[PDB]
């Protein structure tokens, strides 16, 4: 409340640390379905069904240009990538599997880096 603050968590390395995590996601061999925006002209259904498209290259641009106010908003966009993937792809497809693998990979790095 007013003039009553919890002790100040050092957040000065968050930008760099999210960038490293994103680099490791970019270079994973199962990143391929997630590197670029889904082509909304060429993939029937995508535009209407997926209310908020997200991908690594878009996250990378937002990060680099100061569009994440804090590390939670960054984690929300990463998770959105995988939530979208699950909405549109069967679990038993190459892309469905890729999404489950990448989410697991991301969550571990997140905990190890910040929790």
Curated annotation (Swiss-Prot):
Protein's cellular compartments: Nucleus
Tissue: Expressed at varying levels in several tissues, whereas a smaller transcript was expressed specifically in testis.
Bromo domain location: 9-113
Protein's job: Regulatory subunit of the ATP-dependent BRF-1 and BRF-5 ISWI chromatin remodeling complexes, which form ordered nucleosome arrays on chromatin and facilitate access to DNA during DNA-templated processes such as DNA replication, transcription, and repair. Both complexes regulate the spacing of nucleosomes along the chromatin and have the ability to slide mononucleosomes to the center of a DNA template. The BRF-1 ISWI chromatin remodeling complex has a lower ATP hydrolysis rate than the BRF-5 ISWI chromatin remodeling complex.
Family: Belongs to the WAL family.
Subunit note: Component of the BRF-1 ISWI chromatin remodeling complex, at least composed of SMARCA1 and BAZ2B, which regulates the spacing of histone octamers on the DNA template to facilitate access to DNA. Within the BRF-1 ISWI chromatin remodeling complex interacts with SMARCA1; the interaction is direct. Component of the BRF-5 ISWI chromatin remodeling complex, at least composed of SMARCA5/SNF2H and BAZ2B, which regulates the spacing of histone octamers on the DNA template to facilitate access to DNA.
Protein's name in the database: Bromodomain adjacent to zinc finger domain protein 2B
Provenance organism: Homo sapiens
Lineage, broadest ranks: Eukaryota, Metazoa, Chordata, Craniata, Vertebrata
Gene symbol of the encoding locus: BAZ2B
First and last residues shown, out of full length: 2054 to 2166 of 2168
């Amino acid at each position: 409340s007013m003039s009553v603050k919890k002790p100040k968590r050092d957040d000065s390395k968050d930008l760099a640390l999210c960038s490293m995590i994103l680099t490791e996601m970019e270079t994973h061999e199962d990143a391929w379905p997630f590197l670029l925006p889904v082509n909304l002209k060429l993939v029937p259904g995508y535009k209407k069904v997926i209310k908020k498209p997200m991908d690594f290259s878009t996250i990378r641009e937002k990060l680099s240009s100061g569009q994440y106010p804090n590390l939670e908003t960054f984690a929300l966009d990463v998770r959105l990538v995988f939530d979208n993937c699950e909405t549109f792809n069967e679990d038993d497809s190459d892309i469905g599997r890729a999404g489950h693998n990448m989410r697991k990979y991301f969550e571990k790095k997140w905990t190890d880096t910040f929790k």
